[PDB]
Amino acid sequence: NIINFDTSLPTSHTYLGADMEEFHGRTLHDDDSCQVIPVLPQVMMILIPGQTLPLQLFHPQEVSMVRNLIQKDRTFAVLAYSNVQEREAQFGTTAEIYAYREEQDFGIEIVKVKAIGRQRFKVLELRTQSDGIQQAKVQILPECVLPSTMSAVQLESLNKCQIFPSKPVSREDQCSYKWWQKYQKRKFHCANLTSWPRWLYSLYDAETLMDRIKKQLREWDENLKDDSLPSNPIDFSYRVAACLPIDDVLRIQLLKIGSAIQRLRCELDIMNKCTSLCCKQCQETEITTKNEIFSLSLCGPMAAYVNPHGYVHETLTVYKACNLNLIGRPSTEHSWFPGYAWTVAQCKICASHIGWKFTATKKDMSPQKFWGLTRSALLPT
Template sequence: MADDMDDEDGRMQEEEGREDDGDDPEELDGDLDDDIIQEDEDDDSPAEEDDDNNEGLLRRLRLHIRGRLDRDRVQKRPTKVTYDASLPTTHSYLGNDLEEYSGRTVLDEDSYVSLPLLHLPGVILVPGQTLPLHLFNQRIISMMKHVIQNNRTFGMIHDGHNMQPGHDESPANIGTTAEIYSAKEEEDSGVETMRIKATGRQRFQIMETRRQADGILIGRVRIITESVLPDPLEGARCSSHDRLRLIPPLKQAKGVERDMAWIKQRRKRYLRPAQWTWIPPWVYEMYDAEVLMLHIKTELKSWFEDSVKFDTVPSKPSDFSFWVASNIPLADSQRLKLLEINCPVQRLRRELDILRKCTLLHCTECGLDIANKSDVFSMSLDGPMAAYVNPGGYVHDTLTLYSAHNLNLVGRPTKENSWFPGYAWTILQCRHCTNHMGWKFTAVKRKLKPEMFWGLTRSAVQPGFKDTQDQLHLI
């Protein structure tokens, strides 16, 4: 009986989050017909106009499914991004009339609480990440009303029915609390809807679940405590020498040279007591949160090309590790594994290993090469990847890139409900398997830089890793 109720809940979630990507089917068909005609005109080979020709009919049908080629994959990268990166963080496409809520709810660590649980296809919330929602399911809207009247906090868990083939489909027992900070109820043609903005707060472990008479899933959860490792050299240090551990500011050097000089100074001052132990200093550096954060920032510079201002990212190791987890394109199983790690140092070590190995981005369905890691950049203050919701209620973790290849365009550009104000979007498909990959964004104003960029949904891409034999494989 419990399984049947879970299946029914999953179907209701799919109805709520239908992935129509904000397109009107009739309007899209018209656009595709125009695109087919344009593609026929651009084709160098002579076109057959005979409607009775089966080969011509199949060719037109294939173009109807695949769309037209994206021929603008090569562009000169702008030396300066003029776009206001704060605009996407407001999620203005949800409207500016949402009611704001002040204050913050912090649940006691290692405590047991009861929370209403929500799971949506392809959504794994990370602490610190913003979650926009556009709800149509009346049962969930009723749940959110009750949540707002109390502490504005609910639990976000992974939808096990949306796992990729070959993975365990059992529900994950790790989730993240989401606190609502703005919401708006309204009626659309007599149907009640709700728009919500929430923020991921604390991780929790599900101990047990039950379903209420109204169908709401309630979980008894334990708030997870972050395990902070003690200083391994605490017993080897003299407290009277603490003043000698201060690292002077490095003003002359820049970039990598400055980072390496900082590490040498830290090794000289902070890790000097390691010389009095049996373990060499470099071993302690492997578990030094500050050094790990510096190495990760160095790797991210090759991804984002200095488009991310690291002075705006979290400075605490725990918060920084969650920020990294929410901004690298991982499969659901990989993101869940990072959430299961309770120690920030171990989480940083795992993320650094992923960043060093990843070289390419591939299509999840067919493995076709889509982009290089150097193409990733940030169009938002939240980072290169953030969660956005389309008019149908489906939430996409979207990664922004300077360029991408092996993609087809479907439909014409439109500014309606654009996640990036000032840009029009066009649907992208994989050229090989026609899997939905994301959107191409084109500036509607001449002075905007970049003039175009690509937004790939996290569910459609996987990082490509290079093994010891210099061959690529996917996680």
């Protein structure tokens, strides 16, 4: 079920435009400190560091705020929305601008900006400015890194037996179930000094957890070896958390976790314990079960795209989707996928908008076999 498509245009966000003022990322923070950052309202999105955000700006005061941010530290703060409305926020992330284009178009200003997350934080207070853009008191959250669990109890003499030869070949049977067995046998050999077996220590190994997650991802859809998957557990965990089909509360729980190992364990538990989905306002459907969650993009099954009216929707690309009805013609105006034509998909029961049917425009592609859902109404069970 493979189609000759270049999985770089959905990430490139070519639907907005091409003549974009490319900006290089050179922002950071002093780690675990108090800061003040302006917040752009009217955004309902839990954002993870490394996740791409496409934004459309309409109100003049928001345009002024983003322009001042550009002539400043070009980082705003995406707030974390819980179930309770009215800015019931306790966490958030900092988004960095790398993508600025104004274009007053019909004489407005419509700043089109694309940003990604860089750091996490917690809001201490939400100060409201009379201008219309609230600047909140921000405490930057450090990202903890932990050493190997065998470093403390390791035997000094058998430390030379700790550099294993590089992994043999790739994606080959018995090149993993034996190499990893030997790796566990030789790495956590000092577990005999403690009260816990080797497999328990491998349950907390950063490398082993990433290997398990990679196996599960390949079970979902074929990933091209090291298909842009970072070797660092930090970025790997962040990417996995970004691509998982989970609701807002699960995303904020993954965001508050401060250690990569705990994040990887939580993600592996989530995708080994959640199989059935549903849509809000029904709580009665199971459209698009896990075993068919494809990924027709570099970033993964889930990504962020924006309509021509500022509204941002995160979509889930799946192979098949039943229990749906169609309204409207297969338009090709502002489809986020250049080689596809979009159609409005309505829920067959609650008639609350979930999904978009897609059709064919070319030859070497999948004709009318495509679906992109939304997190507007999508929860796991």
